[PDB]
Design a protein around this ligand. Sequence first.
Ligand SMILES: Nc1nc2c(ncn2[C@@H]2O[C@H](COP(=O)(O)OP(=O)(O)OP(=O)(O)O)[C@@H](O)[C@H]2O)c(=O)[nH]1
Lengths: 49, 50, 99, 292, 76
Amino acid sequence: QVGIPKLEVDHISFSNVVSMMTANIRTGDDMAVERVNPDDVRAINIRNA
Amino acid sequence: TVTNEFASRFRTIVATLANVVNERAVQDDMQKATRSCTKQWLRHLETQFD
Amino acid sequence: LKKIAESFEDPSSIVVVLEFILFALFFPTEFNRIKGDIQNVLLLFFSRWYPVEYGIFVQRGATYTINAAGEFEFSGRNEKWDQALYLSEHFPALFSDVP
Amino acid sequence: MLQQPTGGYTTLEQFAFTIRNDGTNATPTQFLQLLSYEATENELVKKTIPTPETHLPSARNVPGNVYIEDAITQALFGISAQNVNAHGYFSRLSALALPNTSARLGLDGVIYNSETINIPFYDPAAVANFAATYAKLGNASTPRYRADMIDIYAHVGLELAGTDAERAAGVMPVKRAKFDSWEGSLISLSRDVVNWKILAFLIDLCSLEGEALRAFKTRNRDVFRMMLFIMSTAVAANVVNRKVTKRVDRVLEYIGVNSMRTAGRTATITYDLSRHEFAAKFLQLTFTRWNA
Amino acid sequence: KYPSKAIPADELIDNLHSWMRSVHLLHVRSEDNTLRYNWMLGVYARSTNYTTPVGQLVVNAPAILNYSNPQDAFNS
Ligand SMILES: Nc1nc2c(ncn2[C@@H]2O[C@H](COP(=O)(O)OP(=O)(O)OP(=O)(O)O)[C@@H](O)[C@H]2O)c(=O)[nH]1
């Protein structure tokens, strides 16, 4: 039998398994990149893509 | 006694690169210029290498 | 590889190619480690300077895998190399030396 | 290692497939009884499915134990999954495809690179058979190998909605499914399905042969139909409810017609384009195996 | 120039002829009998004066316009 989902029924459940990210994850931190400008403006193509 | 096989290999490398730079079609006049200047500079790199 | 931005329009862009050829010579080993990553720059070169040849070549495939009895098997499909592939069965196809 | 019975792994009570319904663990067959179909003017006709490509994608050198069952079931029925092709870990199935590999596929649904203690796993022969076809989930995204994502849904329709006469004919009217429903029914259904250990169903589908295989197709037909149902709601152009005298009838329209929709909605799980390519490929392979 | 009456045939022939002289499509002629010429791409590259990437590809490698298999004419 599969377990009955907790939200499906009106009883309260005071212990639960919360997923949580660890120190290894970190979301939302600013991140750094090297940006490299095109060598010549006139060499840049638009169409045809 | 005199020739160095490595340098000679580089010589055929820049000869190849010079042929490639030479056969490289271009449209802008300055491109046509740096083609030949590129050719000269390769020809100099060869001497530094040797 | 520390990545190069070159787009290979001016003839002088050949310098980048030479910077690689010299790297192949002075350091064949380390070049062997970074060679797929340099193949990515070379493909930008070849697609410009030799589009027809680049067409046939990339049409053979951008990579390959050696099998039993040592025969090459090219991918039949263009795709960018990643160093994630260095530990994989795949090789950059530009260095196959297959006519 | 778990031995595979004369029937599939699915015969084991450990791999029961059962959606929640009416406060009990209903089997999919007895949910599909609730389904009813309004035929409309349009007609689905099933084209021959193109044979899946011979090529098995390279399993890139991946140290980790890739959780594949989770990846697949989320790609097909996950509420929130997206960009299911950017990662490309489905290719990892191919690592199992080799004869006498050190890799094993756990009942957990993870692909361990080496056999490991206290982790039960499917018989490597069977999994080799399963990987030999389903590794091709790895090229679901690759341009040369993408599945048709419009035509295939006709088969979905025929296998879901189609009456035995329609399934025999290979053509059914496009149908508009309906069933008496609870609040948020399609979501809860889709998640009861997402938790399913479908790797059992697939490994039995690929390893079994002879009468024992055909007996599988009949025993598990309603399960397969439930997956087809979740998927069809994922691509159904619209999904309304109808008041029906102090009762509510959920109505998805239409079965067998992929609307190619990508914008989300509260009513059902939604495919990003990657998920469409993926589901198309999965359908191509699974249907190719379901008819033989 | 001629809002009312038909353009006289002499002026039409002369002008159309001079413009016909004015046009010259890029190509590399070759002996292979299986070859065609991707006329669409050729005239298009010409009309843009070879400023589109297709135009650069043609102006640098005109031989790319030649094709045996009709589809590979564009795949190239
Ligand atoms: N610029 C350009 N357009 C072309 C060329 N050849 C075909 N086309 C266009 O391609 C479109 C569809 O190609 P086709 O199928 O060959 O032509 P069609 O659809 O049968 O209709 P028509 O061109 O009127 O005969 C048409 O609208 C044409 O204008 C070409 O050589 N140069």
